Amino acid sequence: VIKMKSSDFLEGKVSLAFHRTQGLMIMKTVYKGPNCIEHNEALLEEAKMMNRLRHSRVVKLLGVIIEEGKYSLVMEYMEKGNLMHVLKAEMSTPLSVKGRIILEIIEGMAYLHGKGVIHKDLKPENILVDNDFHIKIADLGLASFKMWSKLNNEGTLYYMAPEHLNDVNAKPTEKSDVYSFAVVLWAIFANKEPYENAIAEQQLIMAIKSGNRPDVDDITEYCPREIISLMKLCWEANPEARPTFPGIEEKFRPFYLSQLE
Amino acid sequence: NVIKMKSSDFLESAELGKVSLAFHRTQGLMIMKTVYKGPNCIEHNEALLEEAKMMNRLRHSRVVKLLGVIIEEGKYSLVMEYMEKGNLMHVLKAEMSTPLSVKGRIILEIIEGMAYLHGKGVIHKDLKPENILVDNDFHIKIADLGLASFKMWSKLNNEEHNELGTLYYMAPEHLNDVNAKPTEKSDVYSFAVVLWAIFANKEPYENAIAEQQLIMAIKSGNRPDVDDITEYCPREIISLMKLCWEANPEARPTFPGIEEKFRPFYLSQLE
Ligand SMILES: CC(C)C(=O)Nc1nc2cc(-c3ccc4c(c3)c(C(=O)N[C@@H](C)c3ccccc3)cn4C)ccn2n1
Numbered sequence: 001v002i003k004m005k006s007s008d009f010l011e012g013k014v015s016l017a018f019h020r021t022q023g024l025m026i027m028k029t030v031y032k033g034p035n036c037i038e039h040n041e042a043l044l045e046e047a048k049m050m051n052r053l054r055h056s057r058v059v060k061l062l063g064v065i066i067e068e069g070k071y072s073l074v075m076e077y078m079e080k081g082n083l084m085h086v087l088k089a090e091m092s093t094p095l096s097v098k099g100r101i102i103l104e105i106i107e108g109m110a111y112l113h114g115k116g117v118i119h120k121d122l123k124p125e126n127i128l129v130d131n132d133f134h135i136k137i138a139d140l141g142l143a144s145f146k147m148w149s150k151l152n153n154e155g156t157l158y159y160m161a162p163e164h165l166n167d168v169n170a171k172p173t174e175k176s177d178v179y180s181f182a183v184v185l186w187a188i189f190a191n192k193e194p195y196e197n198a199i200a201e202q203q204l205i206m207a208i209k210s211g212n213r214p215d216v217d218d219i220t221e222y223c224p225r226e227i228i229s230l231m232k233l234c235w236e237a238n239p240e241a242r243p244t245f246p247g248i249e250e251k252f253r254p255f256y257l258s259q260l261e
Numbered sequence: 262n263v264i265k266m267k268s269s270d271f272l273e274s275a276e277l278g279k280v281s282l283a284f285h286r287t288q289g290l291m292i293m294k295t296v297y298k299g300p301n302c303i304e305h306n307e308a309l310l311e312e313a314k315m316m317n318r319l320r321h322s323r324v325v326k327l328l329g330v331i332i333e334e335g336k337y338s339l340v341m342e343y344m345e346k347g348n349l350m351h352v353l354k355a356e357m358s359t360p361l362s363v364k365g366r367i368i369l370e371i372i373e374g375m376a377y378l379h380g381k382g383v384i385h386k387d388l389k390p391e392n393i394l395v396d397n398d399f400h401i402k403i404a405d406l407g408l409a410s411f412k413m414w415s416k417l418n419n420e421e422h423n424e425l426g427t428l429y430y431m432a433p434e435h436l437n438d439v440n441a442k443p444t445e446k447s448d449v450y451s452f453a454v455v456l457w458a459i460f461a462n463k464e465p466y467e468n469a470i471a472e473q474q475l476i477m478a479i480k481s482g483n484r485p486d487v488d489d490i491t492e493y494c495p496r497e498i499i500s501l502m503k504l505c506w507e508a509n510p511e512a513r514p515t516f517p518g519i520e521e522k523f524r525p526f527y528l529s530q531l532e
């Protein structure tokens with residue numbers, strides 16, 4: 001990794017970070033407390049793994065600050081924030097830009113799966129948009145890498161595959177993210193969070209485990225048919241019935257090319 | 262009553278409110294928890310000393326004895342006996358492995374301490390590996406690091422002028438329900454998860470993804486994964502933990518009942 005120092009920056013919490021020589025970046029300070037040196041080795045290894053994720057649709061980890069009792073992650077800056085914010089903005093997104101966004105999400109998820117990363121929390125809060133309306137996948141909640149995830153701990157459920165609802169012990173798979181992505185598709189075309197009421201509880205968890213899905217009739221903007229088919233397929237209760245992201249890409253890229261671009 | 266001590270009774274300390282190893286000029290090593298550093302207040306002083314006398318009356322070989330109280334202008338401190346090897350989770354994750362007989366004894370000693378506290382009308386409310394301390398001989402003592410048992414030092418800790426929370430062991434009836442009164446059955450549930458953690462050498466629910474997910478899952482019956490125990494674990498201990506984390510509090514045994522079952526078992530198959 002690149003190791004940064006707090007003194008490298010102008011003077012969990014997610015903040016704008018001005019590196020005194022490299023400029024604008026994003027700082028997430030994961031932990032500030034009395035020491036835990038016994039953990040550093042595993043944290044720096046996972047950080048290196050973080051550092052190796054290099055893709056235009058994936059948020060890049062610029063540096064780590066590993067200091068006595070202070071753990072921080074430094075990331076590349078995305079101007080326009082997360083996908084939900086851009087969707088609900090006062091202006092609109094042509095269907096072509098939404099098609100391109102969806103393809104970019106597929107490409108990033110396929111890259112992450114090809115590097116052995118299961119995101120575990122794909123959701124609109126974790127899809128960042130740059131000034132040109134291109135996206136990058138992020139992990140604001142530290143869900144993807146286990147030791148940084150624990151250190152962070154030393155919360156929407158709307159995108160959680162039903163197999164993880166009321167069952168925290170089953171191991172998540174690539175199909176977990178495929179389910180999340182399906183709900184992301186719906187949300188992209190609804191410009192709102194699923195389950196119109198927008199309350200989370202045991203009623204809804206049990207409803208979803210039994211097959212309830214976001215209301216396809218709650219789409220009040222135009223949504224292409226093939227995309228509705230794709231999301232319906234991807235949120236199948238049976239994890240085995242859901243495609244892989246490379247399969248999704250072999251389907252969606254030619255459709256986006258022929259009908260959307 | 263208690264022993265009221267002075268800050269000047271100690272030569273020095275080293276940080277571990279603030280928890281410190283402190284050297285008493287006459288008594289030697291002790292553990293100091295400094296609860297409040299601020300402007301002076303008698304807003305509780307009388308009750309505070311009363312509560313101290315109360316926590317001083319807990320005298321049992323498996324409970325951390327309160328050694329002294331420091332009540333000074335703007336400074337409030339509790340002083341406890343020192344436990345050499347720290348808390349149970351740390352000892353479990355140590356490089357050297359712990360013999361199944363020693364884990365059996367630890368479990369029995371926890372049972373004994375919990376029985377004592379319940380027999381003196383004390384509901385711990387926060388039993389967990391962090392509150393189970395280990396001496397140099399691998400004997401345990403139950404502690405209350407979070408000031409859960411005595412409410413007004415707890416208030417003093419949170420008073421807005423003082424310059425100075427795991428849920429894996431919280432019985433499901435108190436999750437997302439901040440009003441339910443904890444009972445002895447709560448402490449039994451905590452004991453059940455501590456048993457699991459003793460034999461898995463780690464915290465439960467590692468692939469839990471989000472806190473609401475885990476909270477709703479646990480309230481609906483999810484428990485620690487018994488297969489994730491990868492070292493030998495006797496079958497009655499699996500039975501005991503399954504019984505003690507029963508969703509219905511009434512179905513859970515009591516600590517005198519747990520001890521009745523477990524002590525002969527430990528004698529005949531473990532010691
Ligand atoms: C309103 C706001 C101020 C704005 O306007 N823009 C803006 N907000 C952010 C927030 C982050 C951000 C924050 C915290 C992060 C991450 C990113 C991240 C990460 O992505 N890790 C990579 C390596 C990864 C990706 C996929 C899977 C696994 C790991 C890990 N954490 C903890 C980054 C850029 N921006 N830009």
Ligand SMILES: CC(C)C(=O)Nc1nc2cc(-c3ccc4c(c3)c(C(=O)N[C@@H](C)c3ccccc3)cn4C)ccn2n1
Nearest residue numbers: 292294316325327341342343344347348403404405406410
């Ligand atoms: C791990 C460290 C790095 C190391 O190496 N050793 C080490 N840490 C400690 C920490 C304590 C400790 C700290 C804070 C406490 C308490 C104890 C306590 C209490 O137990 N009160 C008694 C009377 C009681 C017991 C049961 C129920 C109700 C009350 C109340 N508070 C706020 C004691 C001994 N050690 N030894």
